[PDB]
Design an enzyme around this catalytic site. Structure first.
Site: not given
Ligand code: NA
Ligand code: NA
Lengths: 25, 252, 10
Positions: B43, B99, B198
């Site tokens: 992502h 992911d 992230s």
């Protein structure tokens, strides 16, 4: 050689909160 | 990281910064798994709803850093990428299931006191460590608050949460390719990744061979450090087969 | 905010 930190494991020095991890296991 | 502390120098030598060439900004966290491969969240590269779809030359990977913003002139190494591999079944349409991406550096990086690859878990390692109540560590340069930006690398230690709790805390469909971690509203301790963290590593230290393993990748959450809510992470072990497969398909 | 990186990385 993965996962052994030059400045910690390799000199046998511990980081300030690694023992919190260890105490949980 | 919300409610973390500054990492010590060389405390997380596998921590990679995904960096934008232009504008010059932090994209995400990442991790060094060999001398030529970095693991991150898909992502970070591709998120068609937010119009995000990065290529190899949009990006630079900076390893060995401690300071978020400074060019650490003789300690960090900045590399170029040859190729990006996204899980072929990364579900950006629904829940970010799988992911995970791999980035191949244009040239191998030299290990140093500040740079060093984290290990990937084996079935047996996954099996005895990935357990409700055992703490993992997340690091990053992300927001300090949901609602500023750290100077230095931040760390926080969080418990793995039971699957049933994970599930009942959200309306989103949780897959076997995910785990969630964080304190309960009742535990009296908080912390969490947040935007900008992230793609980073959730790692645990094996009590048997004293090595650090990367169990998870900072995936998604509902807020940052919201009570009754948890951080979700890609289950690296469950996707290991994919990881091997591409490094050998061209690496590696 | 971000310090400038050596030209060569770009
Ligand atoms: Na639910
Ligand atoms: Na929380």
């Amino acid at each position: 050689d993965c996962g052994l930190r030059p400045l910690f494991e390799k000199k046998s020095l511990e980081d300030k909160t690694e023992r919190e991890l260890l105490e949980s296991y | 990281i919300v409610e973390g502390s500054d990492a010590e120098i060389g405390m997380s030598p596998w921590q990679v910064m995904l960096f934008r060439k232009s504008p010059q900004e932090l994209l995400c966290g990442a991790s060094l798994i060999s001398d030529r491969w970095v693991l991150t969240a898909a992502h970070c590269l591709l998120y068609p709803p937010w119009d995000k779809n990065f290529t190899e030359n949009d990006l630079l990977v900076r390893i060995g850093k401690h300071s978020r913003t400074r060019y650490e002139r003789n300690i960090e190494k900045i590399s170029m990428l040859e190729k990006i591999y996204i899980h072929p079944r990364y579900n950006w349409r629904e829940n970010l299931d799988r992911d995970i991406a791999l980035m191949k550096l244009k040239k191998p990086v030299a290990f140093s006191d500040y740079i060093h690859p984290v290990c990937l878990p084996d079935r047996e390692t996954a099996a005895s460590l990935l357990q409700a109540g055992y703490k993992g560590r997340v690091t990053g340069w992300g927001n300090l608050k949901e609602t500023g930006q750290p100077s230095v690398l931040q760390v926080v230690n969080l418990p793995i949460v039971e699957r049933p709790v994970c599930k009942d805390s959200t309306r989103i469909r949780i897959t076997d390719n995910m785990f969630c971690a964080g304190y309960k509203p009742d535990e009296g301790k908080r912390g969490d990744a947040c935007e900008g963290d992230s793609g980073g590593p959730f790692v645990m230290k094996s009590p048997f061979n004293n090595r650090w393993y990367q169990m998870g990748i900072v995936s998604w959450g509902e807020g940052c450090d919201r009570d009754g809510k948890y951080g979700f992470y890609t289950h690296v072990f469950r996707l290991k087969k994919w990881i091997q497969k591409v490094i050998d398909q061209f690496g590696e | 905010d971000f310090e400038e990186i050596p030209e060569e990385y770009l």
